[PDB]
């Protein structure tokens, strides 16, 4: 577990899934911002800050 | 002597061409035997609806009789020298090859000239041959792999000549008379679309002068002006299910539109295919087989035999898999098999790519063993590619591909593409087409 | 013809559940508590309904309504104190069940263990929300303190506590929401318990010895139905002793006082079953550290399958681990005793030491002891 | 000495009291189940009888008389030769996946 | 796979002793 | 085609699909709220509080 998952093929799989996982995290961040109506972030995007 | 050094030796495929256009190509290595045959560019894809099956009739009646050689005298001469004369006809190419000794080359070329130029096409022999072809259709009805592949082509290339069966519907075979066959011979068996290929103890100069003195009468003129043109086909992602619950096993073949003959993406894709590999119940590798799907199938006794194909025509081709398994195994494989493709489209590793490269190299080298497979290679490559690709070029293109290339090409051809499922037999658990198309993409990605 | 018990789908589920379920013949009495929990749950629900049929959920008429239950409703005091003491019995059985899971290595059944942890979370939440309903001094001030703890959450803390409060303090809105959640939650607990049993049945129960009991199995019906019936009768005896003879034994007298927001009790404490965590949060000085230790004190049960290192599943054949486990139990009782006691020397030091020792045993001493254990058996 | 403490712990463990051989007490993970399946028939039958008798004894909460307890030097390691091979095979598979 | 003509039956009469063959990557074959 | 470019630029990946949906909802909420509020105020012009705050 501490070494079975630490392998060159496993590291390559991590690199393969870095874009997908990272932009999934971006998906989650943007969804959280939209759902909570986070003003601290939404105050900067144009045409959306007019809502407040 | 290393792999690269042995690869270079590779006696060349010296290629020439007469005035008519019949390309002459030979390959001398050592043997006292030689395979000599012509690879015409006929086939089912050049046959219209009314005359479909003409090529099969012509191939059937080729050896029966000629004008110069009255009949069974042809077979007597072929057997008296020990030659194993054979022929075949796919959807694209039709070929006859005398497979005999080197010393019998002058007579062997003469025999092929008679078959491919002066065919009696006798009406009586046509009528006797008519029943045989109908019998052969009843033969092929039993063979489940052949019928499932015919269903594949019918449901994938629907509305195009490619979807037509090579043998033809069992209605044209009962109406094709001498007139249709003679038109087929005089309109497809033309010198430009012919490759006189020989391999073994054959001299290129000898093959050239034999061709000059025999096949000179071949013409390239297309009657008044009727020139059959190559017609692009339309891969129509569809499905067909001939459900017959009395059959023991359920042959299921699923494919998507792969590349054409000339497309370089063939070299990476085969590697990807080699990663999935092929399995049969009588293998013995079992759970330890490198291929993920092979190990899964052997561990759980899922299927009886799955194998991947790379059917490749001129402008398009089929790419996928064909598995034979019991009734309560069809769905699971269609989950695992697709689970492989998407993984290959998203998580290809260096190790499996190296394995696929080695498998492809071994397949290419092993298939090119013996005079007849070399003759096959020359005849097919001079038509599909326009030249015979040397093994060194194959090695270079294989060395080019890597994990990134495999992932890119699989995403280009496999990911989110409508398949062409075609089943047969006790296909109940067979997932609905919407389920298959949904499985053609991965929500994590 | 087919047997209705094994053919009717409802009777089929019942049959596979507790009629012909292959159970080990050597499971000790400690397994009975499982059934007791369910039994307690059922009893609780019944009593809860008969309490919800005479209890208003308004600040003005909450406490008085409860008195009307005790003083006016025919056989009302019995239902009220049955609920109050059945909560304590529920938590006694819950703690004994968790101890049994720790001891005999039943946490190796991963899905059942996690579902049990979720059930534990839900049960403590439900009991806390229930204690607020009588609207005594203890209920009001305990709810105030507990929800004020959530203000330690970074960024979204004050908003969260104001939101849960439904205002700016514990008031009518909070009381009504607590009543509604206390009503609905036990049904969620019932569903989760059904899922717990479902996950358990795919692997079968674990015997005290740890070894697979597949060779020695008995039908559940003729033996364990009557065994759990006897266990239920004994638990009923204890619970009825509590209800009929000392109904307010495990109850703070300060609860029998209208919730006045202008006067704090001289001592503020939760119910007994909540003290073991409460004292833990008392140990950590930092406000957010208290909340983190509070949640960890229960969430650490998740790490039990991973922290296991002994080659043997159970603990019958691990004397050193047994001393460690009983040290942990004694430490838990120490924390429970300390939590009720006011914060003052020496209880500050003893509580800090108790919490430190609890975590040390759970994460460090037990795996190290198991690793030492393996070497002594040539593995 | 170390062997003295090993023998003392063997006595204090308790599974010697139920006539239980050491390897009978091991937890059954995938490696252990595969190892048990790999056992020869006689060893498997003896193991299952020992486990069943121990389960009986624990259900009735009794132990066999002093004489019929497995001793320290009569406690053979029958599962270990197969368990080590199974572990080696698993490690080889992981190293190939490495 | 049935046969009901001379052409299909042609080549089905074995004239050499049977030689079984099974591989590790190639399916079993007989002749 | 514009649709084909939109697909094999921003629709093929389901995660890119989710990101597109998230940003599209972010902008659509504002656009739809503005449009609907403007329409509703237009229908009842002079009959809402916001149209008479200036008087008082
Ligand atoms: C006389 C002075 C000594 C009294 C016994 C002291 C003691 O530690 O006895 C342990 C001893 C069991 O020791 P063990 O064999 O190591 O553990 C067996 C399991 O406890 C399982 O044994 P079981 O299936 O017979 O159930 C026993 C269980 C029955 O009680 C419960 O399961 C519920 C316990 C909480 C209430 O109670 C206990 O295990 C805890 C001890 C209860 C008081 C004694 O208790 C008994 O045999 C029961 C005695 C009952 C009263 C007579
Ligand atoms: C954590 C994600 C952000 C939550 C949050 O507070 O968003 C800001 C929005 C609005 O806040 P805001 O964007 O006006 O500025 C932050 C204000 N404080 C610091 C008080 C939170 O939060 C909410 O609407 C609810 C907060 C709790 C969400 C859970
Ligand atoms: C009670 C509820 C109300 C009454 C019922 C009606 C409910 C609303 C209407 C139905 C909505 C269904 C969901 C929307 C359609 C959909 O996503 O179908 C799944 C479709 C079905 O397959 P698909 O083929 O359409 O999409 C996936 C394939 N690609 C990626 C190539 C487009 O799958 C997806 O959409 C997968 C991606 C989902 C991403 C979601 C992001 C959300 C971000 C914000 C949080
Ligand atoms: C009123 C609904 C229930 C069914 C859900 C779909 C099945 C499922 O849970 O799949 C888990 C997924 C599949 O893994 P896979 O390897 O493809 O198949 C299993 C065998 N290995 O296995 C996984 O590991 C996938 C886990 C989810 C990943 C999601 C990533 C994107 C979102 C973040
Ligand atoms: C809850 C768990 C217990 C109940 C479910 C499991 C037991 C079986 C179903 C209930 C029962 O006792 O049924 C008795 C009887 C069954 O039918 P019978 O012909 O007696 O037997 C063959 C078919 N089982 O069915 C009857 O209706 C018998 C006649 C009525 C009772 C007298
Ligand atoms: C209580 C006092 C009695 C007691 O538990 O005695 C210990 C006894 C040991 O039983 P056994 O495992 O058969 O002993 C084998 C010895 N070689 O029995 C046990 O060890 C069984 C009792 C421990 C496991 C069952 C759950 C109860 C644990 C204590 C309370 C848990 C709640 C608080 C801590 C969490
Ligand atoms: C979890 C929800 C509570 C979060 C904690 C909190 O303090 O929330 C504050 C606030 C509650 O509502 P509030 O703005 O106070 O209402 C004013 C009167 N209308 O929170 C809010 O107004 C919104 C909080 C975010 C959660 C609701 C909105 C998103 C829901 C999911 C959308 C996507 C699916
Ligand atoms: C809502 C309260 C709960 C109910 C009604 C409940 C119900 C049951 C029942 C009836 C059993 C079978 C009898 C037994 O072995 O005890 C059981 C087994 C089990 N429960 Fe629970 N349970 C509850 C809470 C918990 C908790 C808090 C945990 C621990 C996190 C847990 C973990 C387990 C485990 C591990 C088993 C298997 C024990 C074994 O097989 O020996 N349960 N549960
Ligand atoms: C999970 C099981 C349950 C537990 C552990 C539980 C726990 C409690 C506790 C500790 C109290 C405080 C008793 C007091 O201070 O006198 C209480 C009160 C109450 N519970 Fe529950 N309860 C449960 C289920 C239910 C259910 C299902 C209902 C609704 C049907 C309910 C309705 C009430 C009511 C109305 C009160 C206020 C009466 C009172 O406090 O005496 N309870 N509950």
From TrEMBL, chain B:
UniProt-recorded Gene Ontology molecular function terms: metal ion binding
InterPro entries referenced in this protein's UniProt entry, alphabetically: Metalloenz_LuxS/M16, MPP/UQCRC_Complex, Pept_M16_N, Peptidase_M16_C
Domain of life, source organism: Eukaryota
The name this protein goes by in its record: Cytochrome b-c1 complex subunit 1, mitochondrial
Domain (Peptidase M16 C-terminal) ranges: 175-360
One GO cellular component term noted in the UniProt record for this chain: mitochondrial inner membrane
Assembly notes: Component of the ubiquinol-cytochrome c oxidoreductase (cytochrome b-c1 complex, complex III, CIII), a multisubunit enzyme composed of 11 subunits. The complex is composed of 3 respiratory subunits cytochrome b, cytochrome c1 and Rieske protein UQCRFS1, 2 core protein subunits UQCRC1/QCR1 and UQCRC2/QCR2, and 6 low-molecular weight protein subunits UQCRH/QCR6, UQCRB/QCR7, UQCRQ/QCR8, UQCR10/QCR9, UQCR11/QCR10 and subunit 9, the cleavage product of Rieske protein UQCRFS1.
Gene designation per UniProt: UQCRC1
Membrane topology according to the record: Peripheral membrane protein
From TrEMBL, chain C:
Cellular localization per UniProt: Mitochondrion inner membrane
Binding residues annotated for heme b 1, in chain numbering: 31, 34-35, 97, 100, 106, 196, 205-206
UniProt: heme b b566 binding residues: 97, 196
Any one GO MF annotation of this record: metal ion binding
InterPro entries in the record: Cyt_b/b6_C (IPR005798), Cyt_b/b6_C_sf (IPR036150), Cyt_b/b6_N (IPR005797), Cytb/b6-like_sf (IPR027387), Cytochrome_b (IPR030689), Cytochrome_b_C_euk/bac (IPR048260), Cytochrome_b_N_euk/bac (IPR048259), Di-haem_cyt_TM (IPR016174)
Cofactor(s) the protein requires to work: heme b; heme
GO BP, one annotated term: mitochondrial electron transport, ubiquinol to cytochrome c
Residues holding heme b 4: 80, 83, 182
Keyword check for Chaperone: no
Residues binding ubiquinone-10, per UniProt: 35, 201
Record's GO cellular component terms: membrane; mitochondrial inner membrane; respiratory chain complex III
Binding site for heme b 3: 44, 80, 83, 182
UniProt keyword terms in alphabetical order: Electron transport, Heme, Iron, Membrane, Metal-binding, Mitochondrion, Mitochondrion inner membrane, Respiratory chain, Transmembrane, Transmembrane helix, Transport, Ubiquinone
Residues annotated as binding a ubiquinone: 201
Entries under CDD domains matching the protein: cytochrome_b_C, Cytochrome_b_N
Record-listed heme b 2 binding positions: 31, 100, 106, 206
Top-level taxon in the UniProt lineage: Eukaryota
Domain Cytochrome b/b6 C-terminal region profile: start-end pairs: 210-379
Sites where the protein binds heme b b562: 83, 182
Membrane-spanning parts: 30-52, 81-103, 115-133, 140-158, 178-200, 221-245, 288-307, 319-340, 346-368
Protein task: Component of the ubiquinol-cytochrome c reductase complex (complex III or cytochrome b-c1 complex) that is part of the mitochondrial respiratory chain. The b-c1 complex mediates electron transfer from ubiquinol to cytochrome c. Contributes to the generation of a proton gradient across the mitochondrial membrane that is then used for ATP synthesis.
Family: Belongs to the cytochrome b family.
PANTHER family: CYTOCHROME B
Protein name as it appears in the record: Cytochrome b
UniProtKB/TrEMBL annotation, chain E:
Annotated localization: Membrane; Mitochondrion inner membrane
Source domain of life: Eukaryota
More details: The Rieske protein is a high potential 2Fe-2S protein.
Family per record: Belongs to the Rieske iron-sulfur protein family.
Full protein name: Cytochrome b-c1 complex subunit Rieske, mitochondrial
The organism's taxonomic lineage, starting at the top: Eukaryota, Metazoa, Chordata, Craniata, Vertebrata
TrEMBL record, chain F:
Membrane topology note: Single-pass membrane protein
GO cellular component, one term: mitochondrial inner membrane
Domain of life: Eukaryota
Gene3D superfamilies: Cytochrome b-c1 complex subunit 9
Keyword set, alphabetical order: Electron transport, Membrane, Mitochondrion, Mitochondrion inner membrane, Respiratory chain, Transmembrane, Transmembrane helix, Transport
GO BP term, example: mitochondrial electron transport, ubiquinol to cytochrome c
Subcellular location: Mitochondrion inner membrane
InterPro entries associated with the record: QCR9, QCR9_sf
Summary of subunit composition and partner proteins: Component of the ubiquinol-cytochrome c oxidoreductase (cytochrome b-c1 complex, complex III, CIII), a multisubunit enzyme composed of 11 subunits. The complex is composed of 3 respiratory subunits cytochrome b, cytochrome c1 and Rieske protein UQCRFS1, 2 core protein subunits UQCRC1/QCR1 and UQCRC2/QCR2, and 6 low-molecular weight protein subunits UQCRH/QCR6, UQCRB/QCR7, UQCRQ/QCR8, UQCR10/QCR9, UQCR11/QCR10 and subunit 9, the cleavage product of Rieske protein UQCRFS1.
PANTHER family: CYTOCHROME B-C1 COMPLEX SUBUNIT 9 (PTHR12980:SF0), UBIQUINOL-CYTOCHROME C REDUCTASE COMPLEX, SUBUNIT X (PTHR12980)
Function noted in UniProt: Component of the ubiquinol-cytochrome c oxidoreductase, a multisubunit transmembrane complex that is part of the mitochondrial electron transport chain which drives oxidative phosphorylation. The complex plays an important role in the uptake of multiple carbon sources present in different host niches.
Record-given protein name: Complex III subunit 9
